[PDB]
Design a protein around this ligand. Structure first.
Ligand SMILES: CCc1cc(C)[nH]c(=O)c1CN1CCc2c(Cl)cc(OC3CCN(C(=O)[C@@H](C)O)CC3)c(Cl)c2C1=O
Ligand SMILES: [Zn+2]
Ligand SMILES: [Zn+2]
Ligand SMILES: [Zn+2]
Ligand SMILES: [Zn+2]
Ligand SMILES: [Zn+2]
Ligand SMILES: [Zn+2]
Ligand SMILES: [Zn+2]
Lengths: 128, 359, 464
């Protein structure tokens, strides 16, 4: 109190109204979001289908900030709900299945998830 | 062109900026401003090469040193305004009618190398800094619309920037040998400008959210070998210079690629030509143009003043005229064409002003 | 059946022909570009000159004093000098990007050649009154570009997506190759910003071309459950699938197949525990077990805390490290870095010099304030960078371990503004957090509201 503070992102001063709140210190800074999708596109030997799945997966993981292996089964379910409409609309369902098996290969998700997600994607397409 | 006058400011320090008021009505006398030391001087142009000293301002700070200035107007008052800035990284808005410093902006982490007002919106000010970033301000609503810099911003000091004719894009250049394109016609940028005008501090406890623009719409290091200290658009083509005694006319992408269709991933540049001159291998030496973009002028470290006719097709066949005067032997920091191109003013390191009149 | 000296002259002639033509083409394209452009200038400068005409901007008039001297003998002018009222300036700061976690940073043309080859072939064709003699001649004239053997195979001139119209038919390891080599098992991301070493082959070890390649893959995951492989392929049935079948050191995971974690193991050599990421036996004696605490985990009684490690959300199942993902305040007080439960910090000019960081809310002794984030650089990149840094009297470099340095200069978080002091109120503790070294900033003593933060940079500078 009685000291003048500044926003870390603009160096502009704090008004008394704002009451010592500087919060452009968000979990997923926007730029990391564009940096990741930009870096994936830069790949020569990777196709446009595997590219769009990788980008969408990363943005999902970055939004929710998953940190445990135990979170991976729920991470696929949340992905198929939040990004399902986009997966269908962009024709990426086969590359998505390919991602689900990659996850199982990395011992991160159960076989039961590998198909519960696939079941949920079809249930979502039938809604069109 | 003929050297019709030469003036000398008392401070005896380099004059880094010279700018004509291109907002003067038809009939009104030709007024230009000069920045140098911690001073801001205003002059009126008259017949028989007579220059009349009008106004002079001084910063209360002795350690302030102004590098740049820009003219605008109050849309609801019809008053000309003069923005100035330099070493102390502070923008001042001077009203020469009121004879007051009506506004000021502190935000830049270092010195301001260039100030530019949007060609269509007088309230939108672009400031270029040594702190590696550009900043778009809305001087009506006193807010920071955006900060152009970050992860894919300038890795070193930003030396110059320019809006295009319609104000849809900015092209910046700096000490990192880079030229970066920043589209201000994007939905994000237009929404930010719209929202800035709506921002009323007296109706909220929350500050205005500035857009952080980390990525340009194009970037290149392939035009010059050293720092780039000047950039201006020539239509949809770019004119930029370094210390390699040449102004390079180039464009993003391949020969046939339309600027508005250039992707951020674009790895190509096309060099259309160059304007050759000598003894201008020192930095912070700026070229300028005619309102109608038909003339281009640049000064030497030895006081030679080069003027080219851009109207001719290939730049290798470009008509060059070398303006020289026996008494003019200092480094020409900047040039300025009167709106009608009847007058060309040049400012030097020795605190001198040189008036060159057309015909 | 034509002379080598002759063929070399033909190369030189055709090169200079093609090159002169391409040049003349570009010369025109340019003169066209300039014209097309000048109409754009005219059009637009008119738009501006019109806008200008509908404005009647007021003229400037005459106004401690200053004077102006004319060398071209015009009369001296004297005018009063108005003083611009002092404005206070903020301390110096250069551009930087916000980080929430660390960010790793690493330390003739083909167009004309083919034209010329074909332009010469056109002459070999005219010699009736892709030949080998044409390659030996170009190689002779352009030896650098390669031998006639090299230029022959150079002249001749990614797996297609399964969802695309051109979906070819390859193995399981070719359909998955991208996914497998680009995925980071450690942070669950493709082309991650922290882990540069690609996943060891054991980590990813548990009709139409679009159906055929999908079959080879699915019989690697599922094996003989064709009644389920059919459900996934969709466009087929068990019957159809059945028939098809018959036709301090940095931690890095270890992978020594058919070998134990002995004196020859990198983990063991670096004197590091095997983590959940290693490919060794589930029974590996060098693995870190985790803690069975009920709560707290902030005393030597907790093996995690004692080992200068945060809790593992996959091993520490009883303390609360594995739970309540929505909340940042949990039962386990040893997982603040990983969950990112930082404290509110405020930026203001320092009471010493430059910019400083001030805590918003009170903090107890040894309580976690913030993580010190930045770019992860090699000890060499740090040396290169340091040369530049020394010009500005900077040192925002902080050792992480023997291999890496976090550089908060280009990017980091608010704690980059904590100043140096030999009498600090904060300390830096590098902790092992789910296989990653992270610099934690904790209170040295109790800190009250609005207090400036200081830490002793010297302790973060010794790799002595
Ligand atoms: C972490 C920032 C910090 C921390 C604390 C506790 N207190 C503070 O006041 C500040 C602010 N601060 C101090 C002054 C400063 C200088 Cl003098 C040079 C700098 O960085 C060079 C800039 C040219 N560099 C380049 O690479 C150019 C030439 O391309 C190298 C790094 C920087 Cl990054 C800074 C800066 O931000
Ligand atoms: Zn990773
Ligand atoms: Zn091992
Ligand atoms: Zn191991
Ligand atoms: Zn082991
Ligand atoms: Zn515990
Ligand atoms: Zn534990
Ligand atoms: Zn615990």
């Amino acid at each position: 109190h009685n000291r003048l503070y500044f926003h870390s992102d603009t160096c502009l001063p704090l008004r008394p109204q704002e009451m010592e709140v500087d919060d452009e210190d968000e979990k997923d800074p926007e730029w990391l979001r564009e940096k990741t999708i930009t870096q994936i596109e830069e790949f020569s030997d990777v196709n446009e289908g595997e590219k769009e799945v990788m980008k969408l997966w990363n943005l999902h993981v970055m939004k929710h900030g998953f940190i445990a292996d135990n979170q991976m089964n729920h991470a696929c379910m949340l992905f198929v709900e939040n990004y399902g409409q986009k997966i269908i609309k962009k024709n990426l369902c086969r590359n998505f299945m390919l991602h689900l098996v990659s996850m199982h290969d990395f011992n991160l998700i159960s076989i039961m998830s590998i198909d519960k997600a696939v079941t949920k994607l079809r249930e979502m397409q039938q809604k069109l | 062109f003929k050297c019709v006058n030469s003036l000398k400011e008392d401070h005896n320090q380099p004059l880094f900026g010279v700018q004509f008021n291109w907002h003067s009505k038809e009939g009104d006398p030709l007024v230009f401003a000069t920045v140098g030391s911690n001073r801001v001087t205003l002059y009126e142009c008259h017949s028989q090469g007579e220059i009349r000293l009008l106004q002079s301002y001084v910063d209360a700070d002795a350690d302030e040193n102004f590098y740049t200035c820009a003219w605008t107007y109050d849309s609801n008052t019809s008053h000309p305004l003069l923005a100035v800035a330099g070493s102390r990284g502070i923008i001042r808005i001077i009203n020469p009618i009121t004879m007051q410093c009506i506004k000021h902006y502190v935000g830049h982490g270092n010195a301001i190398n260039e100030l530019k007002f949007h060609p269509r919106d007088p309230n939108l000010l672009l400031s270029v800094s040594k702190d590696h970033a550009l900043r778009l301000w809305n001087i009506q609503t006193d807010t920071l619309v955006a900060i152009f810099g970050g992860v894919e911003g300038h890795r070193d000091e930003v030396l110059s920037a320019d809006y295009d004719l319609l104000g849809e894009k900015i092209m910046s250049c700096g000490m990192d040998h880079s030229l970066k394109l920043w589209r201000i016609n994007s939905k994000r940028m237009m929404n930010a400008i719209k929202e800035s005008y709506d921002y009323n501090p007296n109706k909220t406890n929350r500050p205005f959210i500035s857009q952080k623009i980390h990525f340009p719409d194009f970037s290149t290091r392939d035009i010059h070998r050293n720092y780039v200290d000047c950039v201006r658009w020539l239509g949809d083509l770019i004119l930029s210079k370094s210390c390699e005694n040449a102004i390079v006319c180039w464009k993003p992408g391949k020969m046939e690629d339309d600027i508005d269709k250039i992707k951020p991933s674009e790895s190509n540049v096309t060099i259309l030509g160059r304007f050759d001159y000598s003894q201008c291998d020192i930095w912070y030496m700026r070229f300028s143009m005619d309102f109608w973009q038909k003339m281009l002028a640049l000064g030497n470290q030895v006081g030679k003043l080069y003027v080219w006719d851009l109207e001719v097709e290939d730049p290798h066949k470009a008509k060059c005229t070398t303006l020289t005067h026996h008494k003019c032997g200092a480094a020409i920091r900047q040039t300025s064409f009167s709106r009608d191109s009847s007058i060309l003013i040049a400012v030097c390191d020795d605190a001198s002003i040189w008036r060159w009149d057309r015909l | 059946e034509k002379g080598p000296i002759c063929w070399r002259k033909r190369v030189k002639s055709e090169y200079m022909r093609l090159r002169q033509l391409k040049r003349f083409r570009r010369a025109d394209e340019v003169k066209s570009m300039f014209n097309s452009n000048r109409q754009k200038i005219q059009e637009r400068t008119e738009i501006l000159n019109q806008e200008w005409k509908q404005r009647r901007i007021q003229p400037v008039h005459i106004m401690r004093e200053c004077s102006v001297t004319s060398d071209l003998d015009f009369p001296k002018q004297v005018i009063p000098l108005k003083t611009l009222n002092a404005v206070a300036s903020v301390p110096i700061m250069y551009s930087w990007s916000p980080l929430q976690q660390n960010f790793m940073v690493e330390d003739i043309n083909d167009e004309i050649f083919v034209e010329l080859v074909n332009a010469l072939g056109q002459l070999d064709r005219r010699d009736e009154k892709p030949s080998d003699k044409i390659f030996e001649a170009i190689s002779s004239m352009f030896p650098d570009k390669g031998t006639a053997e090299e230029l022959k195979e150079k002249y001749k001139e990614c797996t297609p997506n399964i969802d695309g119209p051109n979906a070819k038919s390859v193995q399981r390891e070719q359909s998955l190759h991208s996914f497998h080599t680009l995925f980071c098992r450690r942070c669950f991301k493709y082309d991650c910003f922290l882990h540069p070493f690609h996943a060891t082959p054991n980590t990813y070890k548990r009709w139409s071309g679009a159906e055929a390649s999908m079959f080879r893959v699915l019989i690697g995951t599922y094996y003989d459950n064709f009644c389920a492989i059919a459900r996934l392929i969709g466009t087929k049935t068990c019957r159809q699938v059945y028939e098809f079948r018959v036709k301090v050191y940095n931690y890095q995971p270890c992978d020594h197949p058919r070998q134990p974690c002995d004196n020859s193991c990198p983990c063991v050599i670096a004197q590091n525990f095997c983590e959940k990421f290693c490919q060794c036996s589930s029974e590996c004696q060098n693995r870190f077990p985790g803690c069975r605490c009920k709560a707290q985990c902030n005393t030597k009684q907790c093996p995690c805390y004692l080992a200068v490690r945060e809790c593992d959300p996959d091993l520490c199942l009883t303390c609360g490290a594995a739970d309540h993902w929505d909340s940042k305040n949990v039962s386990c007080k040893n997982c603040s870095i990983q969950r990112g439960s930082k404290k509110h910090l405020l930026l203001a000019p320092s009471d010493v010099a430059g910019w400083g960081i001030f805590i918003k809310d009170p903090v107890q002794k040894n309580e976690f304030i913030s993580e010190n984030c930045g770019e992860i650089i090699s000890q060499d990149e740090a040396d290169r960078r340091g040369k530049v840094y020394d010009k500005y009297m900077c040192s925002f470099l902080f050792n992480l371990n023997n291999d890496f340095v976090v550089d908060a200069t280009r990017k980091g978080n608010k704690i980059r503004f904590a100043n140096h002091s030999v009498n600090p109120n904060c300390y830096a503790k590098v902790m092992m957090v789910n296989g990653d070294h992270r610099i934690g900033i904790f209170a040295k003593r109790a800190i009250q509201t609005g207090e400036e933060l200081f830490f002793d940079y010297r302790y973060s500078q010794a790799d002595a």
